[PDB]
Design a protein around this ligand. Structure first.
Ligand SMILES: Cc1cccc(C)c1OCC(=O)N[C@@H](Cc1ccccc1)[C@@H](O)C[C@H](Cc1ccccc1)NC(=O)O[C@H]1CO[C@H]2OCC[C@H]21
Lengths: 99, 99
């Protein structure tokens, strides 16, 4: 669909069989989700934004459904105040910015 | 234009008569700019991000040109690592997400 930016671009995602709200965020290089249980081996990582950094866990080749579009890629899990779908998965579902 | 997300969506903006690099960021409610000399009245304000909060200077009705399209709205200046153009101005240049 076509998403306007008058409100926050919140969408429904499906990950590990659970449904959640996430923000589609062109300013995020990677996808970061509120704390959750994910399968697989994982590596530590720090992501930085306004105000500093947070320590997160990097899971690889994770399946995630974003408004019906399937994606499989890196998903970070950590103390983010908001679920963010970043450019690594936005490119997979074919998303572009247009003005 | 149509902007893909394989790389960071960096664009050139014109503000206060100066040209700068900024990130188009659908994940940001507001526009936050690197520390810079801008004339006019401003009010102090606190904004929150992924790593915590920062004190910023809130300028109101500041004119800003982004790839030729004009926008006027609130512009915060503060210790952000990167210039971010938020939804407050993205909507004015008529920007949307499409997948
Ligand atoms: C996730 C990730 C992984 C790997 C690399 C990077 C850079 C990543 O992105 C991190 C990241 O913070 N990006 C941001 C942009 C950026 C990029 C580079 C360095 C600094 C900031 C942004 O786009 C997402 C952020 C999410 C959010 C945080 C707290 C509350 C609500 C939403 N919004 C944001 O702080 O907005 C500000 C401004 O306006 C206000 O509205 C709402 C919040 C206020």
């Amino acid at each position: 669909p076509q998403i306007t930016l008058w409100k926050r671009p919140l969408v429904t995602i499906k990950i590990g069989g659970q449904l959640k709200e996430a923000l589609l965020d062109t300013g995020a290089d990677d996808t970061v989700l509120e704390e959750m249980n994910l399968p697989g081996r994982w590596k530590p990582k720090m992501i930085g934004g306004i105000g500093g950094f947070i320590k997160v866990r990097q899971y690889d080749q994770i399946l995630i459904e974003i408004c019906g579009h399937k994606a499989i890629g890196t998903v970070l899990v950590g103390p983010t105040p908001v679920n963010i779908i970043g450019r690594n998965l936005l490119t997979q579902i074919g998303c572009t910015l247009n003005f």
